[PDB]
């Protein structure tokens, strides 16, 4: 199959959720992007 590296947001450093760039706050754990 095709490698995900070819085939394929910011990541919260507290809970690892991938968030949309419009959000400056993690929608799960509320950790700020900054």
């Amino acid at each position: 199959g095709v490698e995900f590296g070819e085939s394929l947001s910011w990541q919260c450093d507290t809970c690892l959720l991938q968030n949309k760039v419009t959000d400056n706050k993690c929608i799960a754990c509320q950790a700020a992007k900054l």
């Binding site: 199959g1 995900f4 590296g5 910011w10 507290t14 809970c15 929608i27 754990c29």
Partner: protein, 206 residues
Amino acid sequence: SMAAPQVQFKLVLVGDGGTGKTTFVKRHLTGESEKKYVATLGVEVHPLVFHTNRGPIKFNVWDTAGQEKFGGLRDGYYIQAQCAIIMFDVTSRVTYKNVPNWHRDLVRVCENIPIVLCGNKVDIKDRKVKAKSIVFHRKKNLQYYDISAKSNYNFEKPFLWLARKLIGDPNLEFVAMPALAPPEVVMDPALAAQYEHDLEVAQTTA
């Protein structure tokens, strides 16, 4: 803060207290050494990498800190989950009776995400919830596996099924098993064969 592209999924691991959720997620050694504690939610997020024939995939598994013993989990626990494991204990019928409640709570927040149902502690000889009784998954497009966290029995199976569903590749494979904590108990080979047969029979019988 923003962490410093990789396929990764938020996986919520739910089920009654005492069913083995923590013991199960902890079998994956790197997921335990690299786990993150989330103070605001009382969660430990374990990043579990599996190496597939198309590259690595990480299930970021959300393990509770026991709060399920006292009520439902809060919305932030579930939010943006992409898949789930519902666990029960095959020596405790009540934990299986509660499976529909966990499923309802999941779907209420996350809708139709892929879910695997896991019956844990199958290493224990005096098993109460047997294959013929395990029917909830047939009703709801859920996949079922017997597991034994303490013996690593079938550890990879829920993750492989979820990966195939999430990626949309029925032929996806794991090229190697993850490095797992050595079994603490023996999964009796004959018992495993019986349970696999019992599941086969339940699935093919007319």
